[PDB]
Design an enzyme around this catalytic site. Structure first.
Site, mmCIF file in Angstrom:
data_model
loop_
_atom_site.group_PDB
_atom_site.id
_atom_site.type_symbol
_atom_site.label_atom_id
_atom_site.label_comp_id
_atom_site.label_asym_id
_atom_site.label_seq_id
_atom_site.Cartn_x
_atom_site.Cartn_y
_atom_site.Cartn_z
ATOM 1 N N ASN A 121 0.845 -1.176 0.000
ATOM 2 C CA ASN A 121 0.000 0.000 0.000
ATOM 3 C C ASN A 121 0.882 1.227 0.000
ATOM 4 O OD1 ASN A 121 -2.712 0.950 -0.182
ATOM 5 N ND2 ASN A 121 -3.305 -0.589 1.343
ATOM 6 N N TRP A 122 1.409 1.502 -1.188
ATOM 7 C CA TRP A 122 2.271 2.641 -1.425
ATOM 8 C C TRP A 122 1.437 3.886 -1.197
ATOM 9 C CZ3 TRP A 122 0.301 5.772 -5.265
ATOM 10 C CH2 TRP A 122 -0.782 5.197 -5.963
ATOM 11 N N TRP A 123 0.148 3.796 -1.505
ATOM 12 C CA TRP A 123 -0.710 4.946 -1.336
ATOM 13 C C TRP A 123 -0.485 5.557 0.037
ATOM 14 C CZ3 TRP A 123 -4.201 7.383 1.655
ATOM 15 C CH2 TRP A 123 -4.797 8.515 1.066
ATOM 16 N N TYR A 230 -12.674 8.503 -6.900
ATOM 17 C CA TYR A 230 -11.371 9.104 -7.138
ATOM 18 C C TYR A 230 -11.608 10.492 -7.722
ATOM 19 C CZ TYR A 230 -8.553 4.833 -6.435
ATOM 20 O OH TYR A 230 -7.909 3.736 -5.902
ATOM 21 N N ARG A 284 -15.751 1.407 -5.563
ATOM 22 C CA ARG A 284 -15.646 0.545 -4.389
ATOM 23 C C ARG A 284 -15.867 1.300 -3.095
ATOM 24 N NH1 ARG A 284 -10.036 1.662 -4.973
ATOM 25 N NH2 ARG A 284 -8.824 1.758 -3.028
ATOM 26 N N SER A 289 -18.192 2.963 5.276
ATOM 27 C CA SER A 289 -19.174 3.537 6.186
ATOM 28 C C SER A 289 -19.025 5.038 6.429
ATOM 29 C CB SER A 289 -19.147 2.785 7.528
ATOM 30 O OG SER A 289 -17.856 2.795 8.110
ATOM 31 N N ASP A 490 -40.896 12.128 -19.431
ATOM 32 C CA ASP A 490 -41.106 13.233 -18.503
ATOM 33 C C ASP A 490 -41.409 12.794 -17.068
ATOM 34 O OD1 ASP A 490 -43.592 12.306 -19.712
ATOM 35 O OD2 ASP A 490 -44.604 13.977 -18.718
ATOM 36 N N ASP A 491 -42.312 11.836 -16.885
ATOM 37 C CA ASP A 491 -42.655 11.409 -15.530
ATOM 38 C C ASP A 491 -42.695 9.891 -15.335
ATOM 39 O OD1 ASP A 491 -45.055 11.408 -17.139
ATOM 40 O OD2 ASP A 491 -46.199 11.169 -15.278
ATOM 41 N N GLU A 651 -44.488 7.469 -26.450
ATOM 42 C CA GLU A 651 -45.130 8.263 -25.408
ATOM 43 C C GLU A 651 -46.246 9.064 -26.089
ATOM 44 O OE1 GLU A 651 -45.811 10.330 -21.655
ATOM 45 O OE2 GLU A 651 -46.402 10.435 -23.765
#
Ligand SMILES: C[C@]1(C(=O)O)OC[C@H]2O[C@H](O)[C@@H](O)[C@@H](O)[C@@H]2O1
Ligand SMILES: [Ca+2]
Length: 752
Positions: A121-123, A230, A284, A289, A490-491, A651
């Site tokens: 996890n270089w992040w 991101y 993801r 949470s 429209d609806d 429609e």
């Protein structure tokens, strides 16, 4: 004093809100109490022992980047509580000392030039840890010595000395080198930071891969729609760095920065709905949470407020108007509740400025062809459509996050209404992940993370007012194919399915909806005009239902009606489901506490190994059961065709005709005739005018789409790329879709 010192103080107030902060303000104060509380909470729990082996019991373990990253955030939090005015711990020198001691302790014991820049996890090692460190450096700047302030800035340089990645990552590198540049008073670096923004995935549009596209889409990790994930980060950091550099000798000069203004208009604005950023574009992150849709949405809006501080004349005021409308709209979670104190200062000044009017609410249909997404915004509701194909993957799941995102983007529909908490309040860890509304799947079986095999995924937009989308379904994980379309009017939204075939030997089903009910789970619902039981845990089959009505969790503005043209048989159940965020995000810092939500799940059962199965339903937002019944009596909708080769819906009242053609053969739906795979939509104004929009959703046709309309015309005007070859007795034209990249071509004909 010099420039660097000015910049640093500017950033110091960005983090603190400057000496300006009015602790009298109820929201400024609320935020402050928490910062102090939390800060205090940690401090009075740290191991201040000279020979400590850890700073916090809970976070022990110098080898896990997750833990180390968290010990820095904690420290950053205490730094703020020690630096922001109004805090119970403002100025407290003792606190500052301990913080500093903690830093030195980590330099030798955990974070330094010893570790691999490529460790797991270089992040964390290259971006997360350093961003927090800088913030601390700036806050305690005065109270820090040169030898001490070197062990900090030298190690950071070791991990991240340059800029050279894509979008979100590149921007993060830029803010890391940029901030450490103003503290070490370096200009070479600082200019390399400003220049970084001109790199891939940021200022300049992308035609493939990561970055923003001219159509408003945003991509990260090459094949995932990430605008709200991101993308959210990119907006934030880019805005923060551009504001720091604004007005300095290292101010942004690249001409492409103009694109940043469009991001708001086309990339973010359409995806926000009353404070929330639609999950369908969050990737993801929907499994986190601490980052649900409104929380994430607040951050986006905060970046807008920031942006409005230096934005050119036209845009600045537009930004203020947009943020004001969103702060006001979100009655679910207070905006000021989860944004920095400087953000609350700047916003409050916009909301209270009586001269600033709330921007209008968006009312449109937009096709994000570059990321297989489509949105519909109407006054009372909004619809999110998540698709996938040979270009965009079904879902992302790395680092043991989002283990059940299986069908989150496989023709999934997301309906937004007055119930602003539908997708918040722990929706994700409790909803049946095998039954995402709008989708067709093999009951209880999943699919893998990855792009599909069909290119037919996209849609057409008729002047950005109405639209139609489609997805040629074909899973790799197991045999199952179908043709799914949606027509936004429209609806009402019409959903059609055909060519549903499988040999998987598993019951195939199409899920009409899966709504989270209220705390009691007693929402009233009716079918064919008869009230249904509202007890939890009851599962029932509805045979021959023409329409259903479900009451929302709010008095008004959240009811939903369902119309099934030729009648249908629904499998339904109302139940209380339990789960943990830990189940869809198995990381150390994620909550294991069990939570329970109520749902009303409804789906069509296509049987096992069906061949040529089909379905057709219309979603009727915000209507009362009496209206839904009315609609079902004399519907404004009329299925023209729902075959394997073409799905078309008309429609009656709007004069709208939509049609998706799934094969490269000559076929005709009502007045539309096509010879190639295409998404078409027309509007007819009796004896007046006829409009038509076409698109090659496959983005693979390097020739043309020959279209022919069964109407006689007198004149026309068409977007460039359309060659009309005959106006009478019938309209004929071709569309040059070579390199069209899924765009919609428009043309209007005047009838006689
Ligand atoms: C701090 C946190 C987190 O959310 O826990 O750690 C990991 C990071 O890398 C991911 O690529 C990003 O999505 C980013 O948002 C994450 O931030
Ligand atoms: Ca209608």
């Amino acid at each position: 004093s010099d420039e660097f010192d000015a910049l640093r103080i500017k950033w110091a107030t960005l983090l603190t809100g400057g000496p300006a902060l009015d602790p009298a303000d109820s929201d400024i104060a609320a935020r402050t109490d928490k910062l102090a509380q939390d800060a205090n909470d940690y401090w009075e729990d740290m191991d201040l022992s000279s020979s400590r082996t850890y700073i916090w019991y809970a976070l022990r373990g110098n080898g896990t980047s997750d833990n180390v990253n968290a010990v820095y955030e904690r420290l950053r939090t205490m730094a703020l509580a020690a630096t922001t005015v109004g805090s119970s711990l403002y100025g407290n020198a003792d606190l500052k000392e301990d913080i500093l001691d903690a830093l030195d302790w980590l330099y030798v014991n955990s974070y330094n030039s010893t570790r691999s820049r490529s460790a797991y996890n270089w992040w964390h090692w290259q971006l997360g840890i350093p961003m927090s460190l800088n913030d601390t450096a700036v806050l305690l700047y005065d109270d820090i010595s040169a030898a001490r302030m070197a062990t900090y800035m030298d190690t950071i340089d070791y991990f991240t000395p340059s800029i050279g990645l894509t979008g979100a990552n590149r921007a993060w590198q830029a803010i890391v080198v940029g901030v450490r540049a103003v503290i070490v008073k370096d200009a070479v670096k600082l200019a390399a930071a400003r220049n970084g923004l001109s790199g891939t995935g940021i200022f300049p549009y992308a035609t493939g891969g990561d970055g923003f596209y001219a159509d408003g889409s945003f991509v990260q990790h090459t094949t995932f729609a990430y605008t709200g994930g991101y993308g959210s980060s990119v907006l934030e950091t880019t805005a923060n760095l551009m504001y720091l550099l604004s007005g300095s000798t290292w101010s942004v000069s690249d001409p492409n920065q103009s694109n940043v203004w469009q991001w708001i208009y086309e990339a973010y604005r359409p995806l926000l709905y009353k404070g929330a950023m639609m999950d369908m574009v969050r990737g993801r992150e929907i499994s986190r949470s601490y980052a649900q849709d409104h929380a994430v949405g607040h951050g986006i809006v905060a970046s807008i407020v920031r942006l409005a501080q230096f934005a050119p004349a036209p845009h600045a005021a537009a930004f203020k108007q947009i943020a004001k409308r969103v702060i006001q709209e979100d009655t679910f979670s207070s905006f000021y509740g989860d944004v920095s104190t400087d953000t609350i200062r700047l916003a409050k000044a916009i909301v209270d400025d009586p001269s600033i009017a709330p921007a209008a609410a968006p009312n449109l249909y937009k096709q994000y062809a570059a990321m297989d997404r489509a949105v519909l915004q109407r006054p009372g509701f909004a619809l999110g459509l998540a698709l996938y194909s040979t270009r965009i993957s079904s879902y992302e799941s790395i680092n043991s996050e989002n283990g059940r995102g299986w069908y989150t983007g496989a023709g999934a529909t997301y309906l937004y209404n007055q119930d602003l908490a539908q997708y918040s309040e722990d929706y994700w860890p409790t909803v049946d992940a095998y039954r995402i509304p709008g989708t067709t799947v093999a009951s209880g079986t999943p699919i893998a993370s990855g792009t599909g095999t069909s290119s037919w995924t996209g849609g057409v937009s008729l002047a950005g007012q109405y639209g139609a989308s489609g997805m040629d379904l074909s899973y790799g994980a197991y045999n199952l194919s179908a043709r799914k379309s949606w027509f936004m009017f429209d609806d009402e939204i019409v959903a059609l399915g055909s060519g549903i075939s499988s040999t998987a030997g598993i019951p195939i089903e199409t899920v009409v909806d899966n709504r989270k009910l209220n705390g009691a789970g007693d929402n009233a619902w009716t079918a064919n005009g008869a009230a249904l039981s509202t007890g939890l845990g009851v599962a029932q089959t509805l045979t021959g239902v023409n329409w259903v009505h479900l009451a929302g969790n709010t008095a008004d503005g959240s009811d939903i009606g369902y119309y099934f043209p030729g009648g249908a048989t629904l499998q339904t159940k109302r139940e209380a489901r339990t789960g943990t965020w830990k189940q869809i995000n198995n990381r150390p810092a994620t909550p294991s506490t069990a939570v329970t939500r109520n749902y009303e799940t409804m789906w069509i059962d296509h049987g096992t190994n069906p061949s040529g199965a089909s379905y057709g339903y219309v979603l009727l937002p915000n209507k009362t059961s009496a209206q839904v019944g009315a609609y079902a009596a004399d519907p404004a909708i009329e299925i023209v065709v729902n075959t394997s080769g073409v799905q078309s819906v008309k429609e009656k009242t709007l004069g709208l005709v939509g049609a998706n053609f799934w094969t490269d053969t000559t076929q005709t739906a009502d007045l539309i005739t096509s010879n190639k795979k295409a998404s078409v939509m027309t509007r007819e104004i009796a004896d007046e005018r006829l409009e038509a929009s076409v698109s090659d959703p496959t983005q693979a046709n390097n020739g043309t789409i020959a279209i022919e309309l069964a109407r006689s015309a007198e004149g026309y005007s068409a977007d460039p790329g359309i060659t009309v070859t005959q106006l009478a007795p019938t309209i004929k034209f071709t569309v040059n879709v070579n390199g069209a990249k899924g765009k919609s071509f428009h043309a209007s004909f005047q009838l006689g």
